[model samples]
Target: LRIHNPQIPILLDRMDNVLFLIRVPDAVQGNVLESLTVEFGPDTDLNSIAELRLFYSGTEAVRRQGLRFSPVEYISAHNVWNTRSANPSYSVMQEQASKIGRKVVLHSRQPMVGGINYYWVSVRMNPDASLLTELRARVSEVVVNGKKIPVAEVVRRMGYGVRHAGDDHSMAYRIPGLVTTNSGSLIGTYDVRWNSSVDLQERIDIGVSRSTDKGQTWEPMRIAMSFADIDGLPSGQNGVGDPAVLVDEKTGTIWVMAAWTHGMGNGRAWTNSMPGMEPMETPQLMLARSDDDGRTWSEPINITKQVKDPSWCFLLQGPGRGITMRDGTLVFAIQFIDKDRMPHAGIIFSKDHGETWHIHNPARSNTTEAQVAEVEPGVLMLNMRDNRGGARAVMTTRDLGRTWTEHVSHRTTLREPVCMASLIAVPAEKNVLGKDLLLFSNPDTTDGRRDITIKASLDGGVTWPYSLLLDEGDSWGYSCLTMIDSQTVGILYESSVAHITFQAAKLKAIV
Candidate 1:
């Protein structure tokens, strides 16, 4: 039973009973409201009379038939009276005859723009009653201006969510050291010399591999470049390391970029020196090309002088691949550190497709190592380490690295010490016209680099959200990530000890 009053209405229901009371501020000889009650009885005789009665003004009358009463029985006596009564016996004959005489009624109503309507229902039950077994009720509506509305118009609106996969190193390691491109495919280079107790001078064979299926699988090949050949160069020293590879899609030729370390008798020692042998010396940048897809390589061509002397040079860690400009110029960048240990990145442009070159001064004069990506036709972005403490800075160039605008001069949250990571574009649909997605992977935490994460930006590079942890452990180092398709992301990194082979992970991005 539910009740409501224009002023105030409260309802109470006891098992098998309903009680309602209202005040009569002014009284008239008419009905104000009606109450309905229903009860079930055992099957009865067909002609039984359901006696009905009325009581008002302390007077009472009785009728011995049907459901309707005579008008005279409702007299209020003196314009102020209240009454309560019940039917005596319900007969099947009377109920069937009353249904036939029921009248049809109709009324006109207008729509109210902002009117409120409230509805409620209450039920009371007794545990001992077996008939009313189970009871449940619920209320919901379409709210318009704090008013309930009909339910037909609530479900016509669009919503979405990201998917990807790739490979990753099983443990911690350092310097991707090199990356190679051959026959429309890409391969990464790394050095494991740091994983052993052998002297740094012990010429370890520089590694090589091939990726024919975009980036899905790699087949390790015999070492294509050796260290012993460095001893024969006019400026030869402790072999070549830190190899970067670039392929000529037109000719299927592969080019490798590495820095040669001068040892003992060589000037400006850069490689770590062993006890009784020649000390590792300054590094010189050189390039070697293969006409038959890394089967054999051309003699190492000296390119160190383009930026600076061997003593002032360093290789950009990992496979520092080159970009082919619209005008067919091959542009590459390398990392170097000054006497004060401040790192610098310099760009080189080869007009002859890896044959001859020109250097465009350092893009980041005081940074450790910088990574680059082409945002548009002539637009390029570089993520650089501006401070020794690993703080990252971003700069952009329109004229091919000759000049750059500081998009974000410095960002302290991008701290990661001497790591070589990867960046790429994805798809995000904040607007109907989707925006370019930026993916940056690194250790963004301040409490020691335990968690490595990938942050995505939808609006160019202004802001970022939707991040996922790629690895969470005390050990995981310098990572490289690439998107193979719209849903799959490929990541490669040093798993541990640098001596073990690198591993990969195929991940699905949960956006």
Candidate 2:
């Protein structure tokens, strides 16, 4: 493929089988084209791009997409996404080397219509492709004999899919929770959304994917929590979601907690769940425990009566992972909406491992979807997603969340898009560290969800002295972290590469 003399660069349209239409009323009007070469931008996530094609059409009509085009000039990249692949992303993009002037050669299968005034460069993005930035393009050359030519115009538009919900294909996945069980298995949990990406009222179930080999391989999804049609209502009418998982180290048991919106019709559980205890009114708190290291899960268990205030809008567990303190107490961060319809955050604890549970009062108003970690023996730190939308709200409790004290870095220390983040206390191991350390992860920016970063604080949440950027593309902005090994940290998250992606990082790299 050759570009005779390059002309002014042309930008491509948006995602989902994105098309870059060039109004080349002159380039291929008379002579037969040699080849078509499209240069991608450095920001492109290559693996999400399944295939590329060049079509020659006569008109740019709204209904002319099928208007007699030439052969599909299919272009293959270095790697492609396979729906049946083990890893969620199918394959990793080759952005490490950059795609600045990287070109993909396209060969025509059908001869062009000599009077073709419109040329379309069709890009088939993977069905699992989830990103905010469009597949960008610059110079698309039409080579005839030798010298290069220019591209005409570029229009930015969008196609379909991704957000289109329903069916067994499962529409969306969100808010990951990860933990390493005592048996050394990585258990990842998230919302296996069956409807649109919207919140509750949809058939969203808590799903678990287990990896025994340190994430090199993963077992198929196992439903950790789900609800069927209540009585004669429609199937999935009692949908549940927003899961937070925890593991009792001594008992070798895994517990996943989620929120159940009994019969909120098309409305979110937040405002529509109401305040009551009749099962179909307020959002119910539920859980399922696994005794076999994610091999099997118990049926959905309702625990709302044990902890809910009853007068609040709803109560739900963390949409992230939880922690276990040093004194054999299991803790999961929790949140509830008050009578004023305002949000507040805190935690629920189980001292007898699983027999019973107790919840503390709200840590702070307007805080929700928080992560908890036993920063020290009797101290628990909560990193919360506040409604303000600029920075996170950090608080602490020394008496099992009975009361709270704002952390020194409450809002000024951590910047966020008011999104969920992960916080965990990693105890010093034989060869892992010289002292116990605290690790935190989030989309480490104040404005938007990108720059998925992990930070390490030697002095608790007071200051993050060391940090590492895991991803820089647009993402769903929810992540969960766990200590895969003494020296490695495992992160399961919503990434641009996949609806949910799992990756591991070494300790020294961050702190």
Candidate 3:
């Protein structure tokens, strides 16, 4: 049920009945199926659901539904999502569909989204159907019969409900970047995807939102970097996005680095950015700074000529947060496409407090979005989103990326779905742990993007013994982590609830 997502209709005002194509995971292949819970978020209006119906179709009916990202498969999205032929056969589970909030009692089947033998769950509201108008209901927690799963497990499944930080705007917000200033101000940033969800080549801008009370609340968003008409081009044609935020702890200056596509109409910045030093010919690396603890911002500063090689096709900062070394070296993990279209992950740094930036050799080939942390006093750990599907590529650099050594846990311990993740290091005395802690957050499964989990490792990247489940369902799956206070940690992520969700975790339980 988690995979059958049509969130745009609900958020963009497409009112209609909703149906879920529920898939059975491999672990529950032969297990007896039992009760299911129809969850209602705090945002759902109980009064809005006048009447509801739940109907189930057998396994054979929906074995071959859409799996790939194709438009023709989804009818409403394309033309056939709710068609009679697409729906097939279905039956009611009871005489009436009760409003079961967090109550378990719901279906059957094999997998869908990337599997076979799935089933259909058609849920509709009678006479008045405002529920679909704004995504008010979700089917979560199905009980496998004969397994003796406890009722309290349903309550345990209730996540650490995050506030709506991502989707407040009528447009879109994506690509999270979060940092903590010297004064402990929570700075959150993301691509204000005003036109669409897809990355650059669209009308995207970098926006900043601040939280003073350790992420309990946030100040309204402010533009940190935006592109206007360039030459004769429009806004999107001259867009900037994929921000990497960091704090120069010694000087208390904040930095936001991004890439600006100087316009050639809507398309990807990757394919459009050519090898050149001229601003008008390709995407340019841009930076913005704040001196008043994230209260105000400076104008965009172009640093393309200093760091980017003219022969490289594209060079941009990793779309999440970076780290400042113990010695006050400002650093950001970066990715660049070569002349032959091969992508490499590397780092860009500044020793004089954002005065001059320099690039290093690529850490690994076939890697993209990455995060860096000073795991050891002089050693840097680069956790990269490798092109290979199942695991994250991890490397350690001692000479500031001049020579990279693959870590012992390179592709063995940390798992990912080829997505960007967050990593940060905290001083042992700064938190409630015995040793320095390394925190990493991402969708914790290799199958697909779901189950956003925050993992803790006290022995560097050796083993992640403690984990706090943040969100259990599907989401956009990129996260940035920071220490709001020594006792509290904050996460800004692309979530199912909003474009960016800010939820804090206490240091008491995880260590």
**What's the lDDT for residue 27 in model 3?**
33
Where is model 1 more than 4 Å wrong at Cα?
1-174, 177-186, 192-204, 213-217, 232-237, 247-252, 264-281, 290-298, 309-320, 339-341, 425-435, 447-449, 496-511
Model 3 weakest lDDT span, ten residues long: 153-162
What are the RMSD figures for all models against the true structure?
Answer: 28.4, 9.4, 8.9
User: Which candidate number has the best lDDT?
Assistant: 3
Judged by TM-score relative to the true structure, which candidate is superior, 2 or 3? 3
lDDT digits (tens) for residues 6-41 of candidate 2? 111111112223144445433344454556677777
Badly placed stretches (over 4 Å) of model 2 are 1-168
Instruction: Score each candidate by Cα lDDT.
Output: 0.41, 0.70, 0.70
- Total backbone clashes of candidate 3, pairs 3 or more residues apart or in separate chains: 11
The clash count for each model shown is 32, 5, 11
Which has the better TM-score: candidate 1, or candidate 3? 3
Give the per-residue lDDT of model 1 (tens digit) for 1-511: 1222111101011111111111122223332212112211223211221221111111113343422212122211111111111112210011111111112111112122121211111122222222111111111222223333333201100000000011121111133432334344445554333222232233433455555554434554435555565546432345455555555545566777765565544333333322121224345566777786565667767665554544453444324455555566666656666555556765566777776777555677766555666555566677775555656777778876678787753464466654554554444431222556666666655445545566666666666566655333343355555554344444444321122122222233424
Q: How well does candidate 2 match the true structure in TM-score terms?
A: 0.72
lDDT ranking, best first: 3, 2, 1
- Model 3 per-residue lDDT tens digits across residues 120-209: 333333323321223345565556544534323111211111223324442667788889998888899888877667778888888898
Q: What ranges in model 3 sit over 4 Å off?
A: 1-170
Best by TM-score: 3
